[PDB]
């Protein structure tokens, strides 16, 4: 939408978020990193 309202919005809940998977995520490159 070319006429959406821009910029960064205030009015949010900036108090971390206690609703997320607290477990280890088994989905990452398991290989050594050559970089």
């Amino acid at each position, epitope marked *: 939408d*070319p*006429n*959406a*309202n*821009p*910029n*960064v919005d205030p009015n949010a809940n900036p108090n971390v978020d206690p609703n997320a998977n607290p477990n280890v995520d088994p989905n990452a490159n398991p290989n050594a990193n050559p970089n």
Partner: antibody
Amino acid sequence: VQLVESGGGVVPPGRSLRLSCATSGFTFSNYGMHWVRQAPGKGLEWVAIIWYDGSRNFYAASVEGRFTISRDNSKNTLYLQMNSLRVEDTAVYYCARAAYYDTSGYGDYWGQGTLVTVSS
Amino acid sequence: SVLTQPPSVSGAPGQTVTISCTGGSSNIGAGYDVHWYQQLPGTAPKLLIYGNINRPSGVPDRFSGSKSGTSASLAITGLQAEDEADYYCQSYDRRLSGSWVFGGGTKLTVLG
């Protein structure tokens, strides 16, 4: 809010030229930016907008495909990349900070612009 | 030119003159807020009017706006020589891939 513009000058047609708008007095990363241009003898034509995080890139059809808008939040700088410039692209280019009231956008502050001349 | 504007307006210092802007169902009657800019001759077209009637602290209390349907308007009272400028209205064209549209621009000449 302070907007400073440069990069104008005369360039042969078919060549590129790029402009920049340096900003200060506010957090650059919290606002989107606009480029607009005014050909000598004409009114003001809107050119492009980029959102604060690069998430939106809108162009007037008259400039789309030749003009690219970009920004670098670590430099507080807005850039306009112009490719294959036409004589018709001669204009004072201006940056402005994005703003809106309820239903439409607007510029809430303007830089002074710089002149890009495209000529044989 | 997207928004319709007369090419010219004028009056003597001290007088009230007005600038009109007219649109359609795609850009004024459309519900898009119509704003005004003042292109003083040596600079950028700074914001003059916003919110159809309101204005920046950078604007003399001479200026005010108005909007009803497709009819947008700018009044300049107590006209000064320093008000010579190209005035533009601004809105958003429902069929525009870009974000802003401007009217043709009205040139205000102060007769004194």
